[PDB]
Structures are given as structure tokens and as C-alpha cells.
Curated annotation (Swiss-Prot):
UDP-alpha-D-galactose binds at residues 58-62, 97-99, 124-125, 185, 218-221. The gene is B4GALT1. N-acetyl-D-glucosamine binds at G187, E188, D189, D190, R230. Keywords: Cell membrane, Cell projection, Congenital disorder of glycosylation, Disease variant, Disulfide bond, Glycoprotein, Glycosyltransferase, Golgi apparatus, Lipid metabolism, Manganese, Membrane, Metal-binding, Secreted, Signal-anchor, Transferase, Transmembrane, Transmembrane helix. This is Beta-1,4-galactosyltransferase 1. One of its GO terms (biological process) is positive regulation of apoptotic process. The chain holds residues 126 to 398 of 398 of the full protein. One of its GO terms (cellular component) is Golgi membrane. The lineage of its organism: Eukaryota, Metazoa, Chordata, Craniata, Vertebrata. It is linked to Congenital disorder of glycosylation 2D: A multisystem disorder caused by a defect in glycoprotein biosynthesis and characterized by under-glycosylated serum glycoproteins. Congenital disorders of glycosylation result in a wide variety of clinical features, such as defects in the nervous system development, psychomotor retardation, dysmorphic features, hypotonia, coagulation disorders, and immunodeficiency. The broad spectrum of features reflects the critical role of N-glycoproteins during embryonic development, differentiation, and maintenance of cell functions. Mn(2+) binds at D125, H218. Residues 1-273 are lumenal.
Amino acid sequence: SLPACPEESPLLVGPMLIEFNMPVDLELVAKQNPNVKMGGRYAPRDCVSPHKVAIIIPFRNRQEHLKYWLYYLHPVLQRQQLDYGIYVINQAGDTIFNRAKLLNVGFQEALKDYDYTCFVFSDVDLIPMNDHNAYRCFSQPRHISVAMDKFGFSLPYVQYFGGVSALSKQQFLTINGFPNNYWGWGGEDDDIFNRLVFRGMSISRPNAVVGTTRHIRHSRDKKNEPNPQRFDRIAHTKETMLSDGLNSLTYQVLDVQRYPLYTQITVDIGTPS
Ligand SMILES: CO[C@H]1O[C@H](CO[C@@H]2O[C@H](CO)[C@@H](O)[C@H](O)[C@H]2NC(C)=O)[C@@H](O)[C@H](O)[C@@H]1O
Ligand SMILES: O=c1ccn([C@@H]2O[C@H](COP(=O)(O)OP(=O)(O)O)[C@@H](O)[C@H]2O)c(=O)[nH]1
Ligand SMILES: [Mn+2]
């Protein structure tokens, strides 16, 4: 007998000041966010949200970015009235990084906690400047980080689908999830765009002003060099997506930690096969 939340949250304040030059204390973030429950889980107390959102962060060795992410996003996600949880998918070992494979692990593991029907995939170093930019799913796949400071506050190209995005459970299943074989930097997000288009979908976006986003400046991570096979890979997505993705995924979870503000899943996703 709780009523549905309003369709758009009345709590939103719009544009927000965001800065990355001060230290962050997660103990204090946790105290500032008392309604956030163990594992980084929150649903509103006064109404039922139709947005059951698992937020998935691909991760290795970005603890500092992550504290900023948690400081800024948690208050935003509560104002958006989402029934949500945060998952940091931490790649075990020190071999070449695989962003999209971690994202698939996150989808599949989050489903074991709770009946999530919406998946937001967010890089760790991207912070939204306007809480009108909704971190939940739409009737088409949603590209969220549309106007990043590092690309001059617009799309670097109209088919860009990197950074932060949201797919419903059904959208994600319809494309057989994300590719597993993009090792090292680049192109897995273009492949994901291809997948959506080949399954009859198009990209929904907020406007450039609501969609403004900050990227935390940082230097190159080691073990995530540009993948030189990326350009060939993206040219063949239509054929490869049929049998690469959810239906070809394995991994071994090494450790699950419930911290107050996030669940961290440490996972062995292997090396190129
Ligand atoms: C698909 O190609 C277009 O973008 C590339 C630049 O490379 C992309 O840049 C974005 C933003 O950093 C990354 O998210 C993508 O993974 C990159 N994609 C690839 C394949 O590297 C540009 O050089 C091309 O001319 C196209 O605009
Ligand atoms: O060693 C790494 C490589 C990347 N990532 C994650 O993958 C995302 C994409 O990589 P990157 O930051 O290099 O993109 P860039 O900002 O350089 O274009 C990051 O935001 C992180 O979530 C990470 O955690 N550790
Ligand atoms: Mn980055």
C-alpha cells in the first residue's frame, strides 16, 4: 500500500557544483547518507520506485576516483527516488584490463541479489552535473554521459555510447549483453552501439545541458593499452554478437565484500583466449 513515486522526482535541484580537489572520507560519506543500507542499497521510504536499478562500475586500482563517485552519486540517486544498488566489479590480477567483460559479470552477479530490471553502466571517473540526468532505464537504451567536459560539453560523435549508459534487463538480454573479447582500451562501447542498432533500437539521450558531466582528469592506467584489433572487431559485431557475450561468458568470483556504500565483487576474468 505505499503509492508509486511520482513519475519525475520533485526532489531534484538541477545543476550542481562538482569538484575533485578535496579529500573524501567514506566513513563521513556514510554518515552523510544514513538511509543507504549495507552494500550500498536504497529504496525510498515513502513511495515505490518502478526503477529497480543496479549500478555497475568496472574497476581496478581507482580507489580515489571511486570515493569521489560515491560522494557525488549517492545523494543524486536518492533524490531520483530509485530503488538502487551499487556494484564495483573489481578485476583480480594484473593482466590486461577488460571493461565490457566486467560489465557482463556485474549484470549477471547483481541479478543474484535482487530482481533488478534496469542496469546503469558507469565508468568510475564520471560525475553528472545535473540531477535531472536520470540514472535509470527508458523504452530505448539510454546514453547518459552525453556532454562531458573532456569532449567540450558535447558528444565526440553522434554514435558515441561510452561513459555512462543504461539498458533495461530486456534491452541487455536482446543484444546478448556485451562483448567479452575487447581487451585493453577502446571500441567495446562502439561494439555495444552496433549491437543495439542491429537489434532494432536507437539511443535515447537527455539534452546537452542536463547531460553535462565531469570526468576526473587522470593519467594512463598501465595494463589497458589501446587494443590494436578494435577497428576490425567493431566492423564485425553483427556476426560476432550472436555467439560472443552473455551466452559465452565465464568467470570466477574470488571475493564479495559488502561495504556500507557499495558491494565490491572481485573477479577473475582470465586473459585472452
Ligand atoms: C568509432 O570511432 C569513432 O571514434 C574514434 C575515437 O575512438 C573512440 O573514442 C571514444 C572516446 O574516447 C572511445 O569511447 C571509443 O572506444 C573509441 N572507439 C574506438 C574504436 O577507438 C575516432 O577516431 C573515429 O574517427 C570515430 O569518430
Ligand atoms: O586500470 C583501469 C582501467 C580502467 N578502469 C575503469 O574503466 C573505465 C574506462 O577507462 P579510462 O578511464 O581509461 O577511459 P579514458 O578516460 O582514458 O578515456 C574507467 O573509468 C574505470 O571505471 C579501471 O578501473 N582501471
Ligand atoms: Mn577516464
